[PDB]
CSV table of C-alpha atoms in Angstrom, one decimal:
chain,number,residue,atom,x,y,z
A,1,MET,CA,-19.5,-20.0,22.6
A,2,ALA,CA,-15.8,-19.8,22.0
A,3,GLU,CA,-14.0,-19.5,25.3
A,4,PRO,CA,-11.5,-16.7,26.0
A,5,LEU,CA,-8.0,-18.1,25.6
A,6,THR,CA,-5.9,-17.2,28.7
A,7,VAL,CA,-3.4,-20.1,29.2
A,8,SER,CA,-0.3,-20.4,27.1
A,9,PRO,CA,1.1,-23.8,26.1
A,10,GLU,CA,4.3,-25.0,27.6
A,11,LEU,CA,7.3,-24.1,25.3
A,12,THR,CA,8.3,-27.8,24.9
A,13,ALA,CA,4.9,-29.5,24.6
A,14,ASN,CA,3.8,-31.8,21.8
A,15,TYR,CA,2.0,-29.2,19.7
A,16,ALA,CA,2.2,-28.4,16.0
A,17,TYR,CA,1.5,-24.7,15.4
A,18,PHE,CA,-0.4,-23.2,12.5
A,19,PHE,CA,-0.7,-19.4,12.3
A,20,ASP,CA,-2.6,-17.3,9.8
A,21,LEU,CA,-0.9,-14.0,8.9
A,22,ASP,CA,-3.1,-11.0,8.2
A,23,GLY,CA,-5.3,-10.3,11.2
A,24,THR,CA,-3.5,-12.9,13.4
A,25,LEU,CA,0.2,-12.2,13.5
A,26,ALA,CA,0.0,-8.8,11.9
A,27,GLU,CA,-2.3,-5.9,12.5
A,28,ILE,CA,-4.8,-5.1,9.8
A,29,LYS,CA,-3.8,-2.1,7.6
A,30,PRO,CA,-5.6,0.0,4.9
A,31,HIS,CA,-3.4,-1.7,2.3
A,32,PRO,CA,-1.7,-5.2,2.2
A,33,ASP,CA,1.8,-3.6,1.5
A,34,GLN,CA,1.6,-1.7,4.8
A,35,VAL,CA,1.3,-4.9,6.8
A,36,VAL,CA,4.3,-5.9,8.9
A,37,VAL,CA,5.1,-8.7,11.3
A,38,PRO,CA,7.3,-7.0,14.0
A,39,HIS,CA,10.7,-8.5,14.1
A,40,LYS,CA,10.3,-9.5,17.8
A,41,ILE,CA,7.2,-11.5,16.9
A,42,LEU,CA,9.1,-13.3,14.1
A,43,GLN,CA,11.9,-14.1,16.6
A,44,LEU,CA,9.3,-15.6,18.9
A,45,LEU,CA,7.8,-17.7,16.1
A,46,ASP,CA,11.3,-18.9,15.2
A,47,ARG,CA,12.1,-19.8,18.8
A,48,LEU,CA,8.7,-21.6,19.2
A,49,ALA,CA,9.3,-23.6,16.1
A,50,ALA,CA,12.8,-24.5,17.2
A,51,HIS,CA,11.5,-25.9,20.5
A,52,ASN,CA,8.9,-28.0,18.7
A,53,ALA,CA,11.0,-29.9,16.1
A,54,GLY,CA,10.2,-27.2,13.5
A,55,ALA,CA,6.5,-28.0,13.6
A,56,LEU,CA,5.2,-24.4,12.9
A,57,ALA,CA,3.7,-23.3,9.6
A,58,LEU,CA,2.2,-20.1,8.3
A,59,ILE,CA,-1.3,-20.8,6.7
A,60,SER,CA,-2.5,-17.7,4.8
A,61,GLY,CA,-4.4,-16.5,1.8
A,62,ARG,CA,-1.3,-14.6,0.7
A,63,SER,CA,1.1,-16.0,-1.9
A,64,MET,CA,4.2,-17.8,-0.6
A,65,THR,CA,6.5,-15.1,-2.0
A,66,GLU,CA,4.6,-12.5,0.0
A,67,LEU,CA,4.8,-14.7,3.2
A,68,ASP,CA,8.6,-15.0,2.8
A,69,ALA,CA,8.9,-11.2,2.5
A,70,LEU,CA,6.7,-10.8,5.6
A,71,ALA,CA,8.7,-13.4,7.5
A,72,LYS,CA,12.1,-12.3,6.4
A,73,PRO,CA,14.8,-13.3,7.5
A,74,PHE,CA,13.0,-16.4,8.7
A,75,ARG,CA,11.9,-19.3,6.4
A,76,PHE,CA,8.9,-21.3,7.7
A,77,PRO,CA,6.8,-24.1,6.2
A,78,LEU,CA,4.0,-22.3,4.4
A,79,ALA,CA,0.6,-22.6,2.9
A,80,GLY,CA,-0.2,-19.8,0.5
A,81,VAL,CA,-3.4,-18.9,-1.3
A,82,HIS,CA,-5.4,-20.9,1.3
A,83,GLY,CA,-3.4,-24.1,0.5
A,84,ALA,CA,-3.1,-23.9,-3.3
A,85,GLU,CA,0.6,-23.2,-2.7
A,86,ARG,CA,2.4,-25.1,0.0
A,87,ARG,CA,6.0,-25.6,1.1
A,88,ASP,CA,6.9,-28.5,3.5
A,89,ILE,CA,9.7,-28.7,6.0
A,90,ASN,CA,12.1,-29.9,3.3
A,91,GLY,CA,11.4,-26.8,1.2
A,92,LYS,CA,9.5,-28.8,-1.4
A,93,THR,CA,6.7,-26.7,-2.9
A,94,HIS,CA,3.3,-27.9,-4.1
A,95,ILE,CA,1.4,-25.8,-6.5
A,96,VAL,CA,-2.2,-26.3,-7.7
A,97,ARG,CA,-2.4,-25.7,-11.4
A,98,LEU,CA,-5.3,-24.3,-13.3
A,99,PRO,CA,-5.7,-24.7,-17.1
A,100,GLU,CA,-4.1,-21.8,-18.9
A,101,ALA,CA,-7.3,-21.0,-20.8
A,102,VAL,CA,-9.2,-20.8,-17.6
A,103,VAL,CA,-6.7,-18.4,-16.0
A,104,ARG,CA,-6.7,-16.3,-19.2
A,105,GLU,CA,-10.4,-16.2,-19.7
A,106,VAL,CA,-11.4,-15.5,-16.1
A,107,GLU,CA,-8.8,-12.7,-15.7
A,108,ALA,CA,-10.0,-10.9,-18.8
A,109,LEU,CA,-13.6,-11.3,-17.6
A,110,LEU,CA,-12.9,-9.9,-14.2
A,111,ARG,CA,-10.8,-7.0,-15.5
A,112,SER,CA,-13.8,-5.5,-17.4
A,113,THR,CA,-15.8,-5.0,-14.2
A,114,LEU,CA,-13.0,-3.9,-11.9
A,115,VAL,CA,-11.5,-1.2,-14.3
A,116,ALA,CA,-14.8,0.6,-14.1
A,117,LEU,CA,-15.2,0.5,-10.3
A,118,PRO,CA,-12.9,2.9,-8.4
A,119,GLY,CA,-11.6,1.6,-5.2
A,120,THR,CA,-11.7,-2.1,-6.2
A,121,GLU,CA,-8.6,-4.1,-7.0
A,122,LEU,CA,-8.2,-7.3,-9.0
A,123,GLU,CA,-5.3,-9.4,-7.7
A,124,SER,CA,-4.1,-12.3,-9.7
A,125,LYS,CA,-2.3,-15.1,-7.8
A,126,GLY,CA,-1.5,-17.5,-10.6
A,127,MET,CA,-4.2,-20.1,-9.6
A,128,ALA,CA,-6.5,-17.7,-7.8
A,129,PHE,CA,-8.0,-14.2,-8.1
A,130,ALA,CA,-8.8,-11.8,-5.3
A,131,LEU,CA,-11.3,-9.0,-5.6
A,132,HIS,CA,-10.4,-6.3,-3.0
A,133,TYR,CA,-12.9,-3.6,-2.0
A,134,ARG,CA,-11.6,-2.2,1.3
A,135,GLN,CA,-11.6,1.3,-0.2
A,136,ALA,CA,-15.1,0.9,-1.6
A,137,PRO,CA,-17.3,-1.4,0.5
A,138,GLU,CA,-20.3,-0.3,-1.6
A,139,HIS,CA,-19.1,-2.5,-4.4
A,140,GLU,CA,-19.1,-5.7,-2.3
A,141,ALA,CA,-22.4,-7.0,-3.6
A,142,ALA,CA,-21.3,-6.5,-7.2
A,143,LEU,CA,-18.0,-8.2,-6.7
A,144,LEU,CA,-19.6,-11.1,-4.8
A,145,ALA,CA,-22.2,-11.6,-7.6
A,146,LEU,CA,-19.4,-11.5,-10.2
A,147,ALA,CA,-17.3,-14.1,-8.3
A,148,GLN,CA,-20.5,-16.2,-7.8
A,149,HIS,CA,-21.2,-16.2,-11.6
A,150,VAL,CA,-17.6,-17.1,-12.3
A,151,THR,CA,-17.4,-19.9,-9.8
A,152,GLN,CA,-20.7,-21.3,-11.2
A,153,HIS,CA,-19.6,-21.2,-14.8
A,154,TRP,CA,-16.1,-22.7,-14.2
A,155,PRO,CA,-16.4,-25.9,-12.1
A,156,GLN,CA,-12.7,-25.8,-11.4
A,157,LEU,CA,-13.2,-22.6,-9.3
A,158,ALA,CA,-14.7,-22.0,-5.9
A,159,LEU,CA,-15.7,-19.0,-3.9
A,160,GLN,CA,-13.9,-17.7,-0.8
A,161,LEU,CA,-15.4,-14.7,0.9
A,162,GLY,CA,-13.2,-12.8,3.3
A,163,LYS,CA,-12.7,-9.4,5.1
A,164,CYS,CA,-12.9,-6.7,2.4
A,165,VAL,CA,-12.2,-9.3,-0.3
A,166,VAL,CA,-14.0,-11.9,-2.5
A,167,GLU,CA,-11.6,-14.6,-3.7
A,168,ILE,CA,-11.9,-17.1,-6.6
A,169,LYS,CA,-9.8,-20.2,-5.8
A,170,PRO,CA,-9.4,-23.7,-7.1
A,171,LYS,CA,-12.1,-26.0,-6.0
A,172,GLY,CA,-11.0,-28.3,-3.2
A,173,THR,CA,-8.5,-25.7,-1.9
A,174,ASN,CA,-9.1,-24.6,1.7
A,175,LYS,CA,-7.1,-24.1,4.9
A,176,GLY,CA,-8.4,-27.4,6.4
A,177,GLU,CA,-6.9,-29.3,3.5
A,178,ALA,CA,-3.6,-27.4,3.9
A,179,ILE,CA,-3.4,-28.3,7.6
A,180,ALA,CA,-4.3,-31.8,6.7
A,181,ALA,CA,-1.4,-32.0,4.3
A,182,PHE,CA,1.1,-30.9,7.0
A,183,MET,CA,-0.4,-33.1,9.7
A,184,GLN,CA,0.6,-36.3,7.8
A,185,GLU,CA,4.2,-35.1,7.3
A,186,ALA,CA,7.1,-34.8,9.7
A,187,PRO,CA,7.6,-32.9,11.9
A,188,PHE,CA,3.9,-32.1,12.3
A,189,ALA,CA,2.7,-35.7,12.4
A,190,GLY,CA,2.3,-37.1,15.9
A,191,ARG,CA,1.8,-33.7,17.4
A,192,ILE,CA,-1.4,-31.9,18.6
A,193,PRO,CA,-2.5,-29.3,16.0
A,194,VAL,CA,-3.0,-25.7,17.2
A,195,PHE,CA,-4.4,-23.2,14.6
A,196,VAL,CA,-4.9,-19.4,15.1
A,197,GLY,CA,-6.8,-17.4,12.6
A,198,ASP,CA,-9.3,-14.6,12.1
A,199,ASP,CA,-11.3,-14.9,8.9
A,200,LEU,CA,-13.9,-17.1,7.1
A,201,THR,CA,-11.1,-19.0,5.3
A,202,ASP,CA,-9.8,-20.0,8.7
A,203,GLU,CA,-13.1,-21.7,9.7
A,204,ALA,CA,-12.1,-24.6,7.5
A,205,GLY,CA,-9.0,-25.0,9.5
A,206,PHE,CA,-10.8,-24.7,12.8
A,207,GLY,CA,-13.1,-27.5,11.8
A,208,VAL,CA,-10.4,-30.1,11.0
A,209,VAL,CA,-8.3,-29.0,14.1
A,210,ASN,CA,-11.4,-29.4,16.3
A,211,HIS,CA,-12.0,-32.9,14.8
A,212,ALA,CA,-8.3,-33.7,15.4
A,213,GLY,CA,-8.6,-33.0,19.1
A,214,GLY,CA,-6.4,-29.9,18.6
A,215,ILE,CA,-6.7,-26.3,19.7
A,216,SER,CA,-8.6,-23.8,17.5
A,217,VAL,CA,-8.2,-20.1,18.2
A,218,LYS,CA,-10.3,-17.3,16.7
A,219,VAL,CA,-8.8,-13.8,16.7
A,220,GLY,CA,-11.2,-10.8,16.9
A,221,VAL,CA,-15.0,-10.6,16.7
A,222,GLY,CA,-17.5,-12.7,14.9
A,223,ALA,CA,-19.2,-16.1,15.0
A,224,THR,CA,-16.8,-19.0,14.8
A,225,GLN,CA,-16.4,-22.7,15.3
A,226,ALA,CA,-13.1,-22.1,17.0
A,227,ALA,CA,-13.1,-23.4,20.6
A,228,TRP,CA,-11.1,-20.5,21.9
A,229,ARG,CA,-10.8,-16.8,21.2
A,230,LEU,CA,-8.2,-14.0,21.4
A,231,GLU,CA,-9.5,-10.4,21.2
A,232,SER,CA,-6.9,-8.8,18.9
A,233,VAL,CA,-3.5,-9.2,17.2
A,234,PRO,CA,-1.6,-7.8,20.3
A,235,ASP,CA,-3.3,-10.6,22.3
A,236,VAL,CA,-1.8,-13.1,19.9
A,237,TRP,CA,1.5,-11.4,20.4
A,238,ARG,CA,1.2,-11.6,24.2
A,239,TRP,CA,0.1,-15.2,24.0
A,240,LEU,CA,3.1,-16.1,21.9
A,241,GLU,CA,5.4,-14.3,24.3
A,242,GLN,CA,4.0,-16.2,27.3
A,243,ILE,CA,4.7,-19.5,25.6
A,244,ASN,CA,8.3,-18.5,25.0
A,245,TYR,CA,8.8,-16.7,28.4
A,246,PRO,CA,6.2,-17.7,31.0
């Protein structure tokens, strides 16, 4: 029911922009380290932010250190780890903290399963854990069940399924909450939110943006509550270029 997005906003309208990274601004790759945001796209994002009072943020499951490397040389407001890390327009960073005993126990628990399963990868993000299986989709059900058991045993932790990944995150952390935190701060406050994303974590952002009277954009295939849809990452690129140079 999402409608194909074909119109680009005017460069100097009253929008606040939120972009997911993987699968939205950058093409999907077999490995996260092979992902690149083309420099021309980064320039377009920087120019779009500059014409909108700096109201543009990257909202991603990646850590903020990884976002800064992907966005180099540009420094944007960020939400990393689905919002458990955040950096506002003034550079102030906000980090969700888990008890050290929880981080220590869960990591040791997860390690035992993932050492024995080739193709799976345990990624520790400080306040979250990501179970990757892009190279071994047959282990999805086992990783999902493990993450479900962990998130049921530790009430501080919540489940976040995604593309080729099952993530364990702090309870209450989600991309709708990240966008909410920005939308009450300058320069995002008073503007109309626009959020472009591609995965299940982005549906939380689509919901708050729809409720806000903003513009929600799904990239790629799949059911969504986004109001609008772009077919692929190059369609995001062309949309971004049309905003800057209509």
